[PDB]
């Protein structure tokens, strides 16, 4: 006897949440002026 | 007579301080960005700062 394989949809996450990671400090993005290079974005660890 | 400094020892081994051209530029006006006498109070209130 043969039963068909269980269906699975390996697609992207909804809204790509998990493709990009801020709010886990260390490897987060900066947005700074070129002349200053001090970020306007620092995250907190417990901030979704 | 018009140009050279009147001195006794032509070719002196050690020139004095005043007879050598110095370099006196303008005093360097430094623009301090953020006076921290009231800025450390802002962080102790709880606000973390960024940018600049």
Hey, CA dihedral for B19, B23, B26, B29, is it positive or negative?
Answer: negative
b/e map of B29-47 (b: 16 or more CB within 10 Å)? eeeeeeeeeeeeeeeeeee
Write the Ramachandran bin of A23: left for phi over 0, alpha for psi from -120 to 50, otherwise beta. Answer: left
Which of A42, A43, A44, A45 is most worth mutating to test chain B (most B CB atoms within 10 A of its CB)? A42
Tell me how the structure was determined. Answer: cryo-EM
Q: Quote the tokens at residue B27.
A: 């005093």
Distance, CA of B40 to CA of B30 (rounded, Å): 21
Give the distance from CA A40 to its chain's centroid: 19
Cα angle value B5/B9/B14 (rounded, 5°): 85
Element housing B46 (H / E): none
Measure A33 CA to nearest chain B CA, in Å.
8
Inter-chain CB proximity A41 and B50 less than 8 Å: yes
Question: Concatenated DSSP letters for A19-36?
Answer: TB--SSSSS------TTT
Inter-chain CB proximity A39 and B48 less than 8 Å: no
Chain length of chain B? 52
Cα angle value B31/B40/A32 (rounded, 5°): 60
Resolution value in angstroms: 4.0
Measure A19 CA to nearest chain B CA, in Å.
25
A1 vs A5, A8, A14, B29, CA distance in Å?
Answer: 13, 22, 37, 89
Distance, CA of A40 to CA of B48 (rounded, Å): 11
């Amino acid at each position: 006897q043969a039963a068909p394989n269980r269906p699975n949809y390996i697609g992207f996450r909804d809204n790509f949440i998990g493709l990009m990671y801020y709010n886990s400090t260390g490897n987060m993005g900066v947005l700074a002026g070129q002349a200053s290079q001090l970020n306007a974005v620092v995250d907190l660890q417990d901030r979704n | 007579a018009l140009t050279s400094t009147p001195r006794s020892q032509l070719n002196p081994p050690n020139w004095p301080a005043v007879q050598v051209y110095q370099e006196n530029p303008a005093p360097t006006t430094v623009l301090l960005p953020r006076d921290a006498e009231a800025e450390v109070q802002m962080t102790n209130s709880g606000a973390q700062l960024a940018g600049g």
